[PDB]
Structures are given as C-alpha cells and as structure tokens.
Amino acid sequence: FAFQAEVNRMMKLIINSLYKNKEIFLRELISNASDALDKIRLISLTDENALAGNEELTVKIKCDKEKNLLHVTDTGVGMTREELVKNLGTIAKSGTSEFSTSELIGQFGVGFYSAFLVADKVIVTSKHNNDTQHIWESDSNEFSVIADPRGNTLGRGTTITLVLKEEASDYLELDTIKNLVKKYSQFINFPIYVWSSKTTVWDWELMN
C-alpha cells in the first residue's frame, strides 16, 4: 500500500543527507523531541498533573567524547514499555526475525534509520506516566528492552543515546555539536540546551 510510498520518501531523504554531511540524524533528533514535548503539553490541557514527574519542558544534549556517545534528553510524553516494543513497526525482538506501520515509518523512519549514518546502535531510555522506566536498544534490525536498573531517573521523557562509530568522532566536539544544534533548533519553541564549557566550569547553555 502506501507503506512503499513512505519508504520511498525515507530512502530519498537519508541518501540525500549523505551528500550534505549526514546531518539529518540530528535534525530528526531535535524535531522528534519537539513533537514529544508537544504531545505532553497537549495532554496537560486535560490532565491536571500530567507534568508531575518533570515540570519542565526542555531538550538537553550532552557529549561524552571519551566514551564516544551522544545523548539527547527531552522531557516529552515518553513511551510505555508497550510503545517501545511496537517502536516503528519494523524492529523485531532479538531472535524473532525468521517469523499502522506506514504511518510510523512516515514520521519516525527517517530519524531512526539515519541515526545509523553515524551510530552502530541506538539506545532509547524512556519514562512514560503510569509506567516504569525502560531501556531499549537496537542494531537497526532487532531490539531488546529491559527495565532501567536505576529506576525512574528521567521523571518523564526520553533520552536517545547514539553509540557513535569512530568514523564519526568529530561530531562529539563541542564547537561541532553547538553549531549544528543552533542551526536545527532556531524554530523549535522549546528551550534546547547543550552541555558546554566556560573558562573551567561546565553548565547547560541555551542554543535557541
């Protein structure tokens, strides 16, 4: 059906970004975090205390240069364990490959699959209201999900961790992330921060 139409759009956008410095993974990281924040703000209109777990609506990005990791943390609606298992309808549980999705592909396919332009794995730590906090890890093909051993550390929202390839080590430099976040967040209504350094003290720096 239209599942091939959205897949066609996804191939077009991901390969197009391969010419332009493979930056579409970061634009999608910011855009999807913004939509998740929009979702919980819409819910807070009906629910009185929908923000009781985390009363702030932010996007916070931190680089781990020595560990070669990229963290993007938003305080959006989050995802239940049942929502992590569904993901975007294309990732199966580990060991079950030999056994709608079109709407999930059209919205999240570009963001998920373009992350593997620079990352070997994609790890999702999410905390949704009325559910515990879980960790979800995928190799682009299969996934595995467990409950976070640390418990509820986000209050509410989602942290996307990208285990970057060494090929993409230059993305973790402060001046690189900051210029890229500033470019792709100038139209996001929510405040977006990057863990930056000032001389030496470290603190969140507003980028938009």
Ligand SMILES: COC(=O)c1c(O)cc(O)c(C(=O)OC)c1CCc1nccn1Cc1ccccc1
């Ligand atoms: C690939 O990271 C995301 O797309 C993503 C993000 O960057 C920031 C977020 O806050 C959230 C989020 O929690 O939205 C509530 C997501 C998940 C967006 C989503 N909502 C329903 C399905 N998906 C796609 C998906 C992909 C992999 C595993 C699970 C779900």
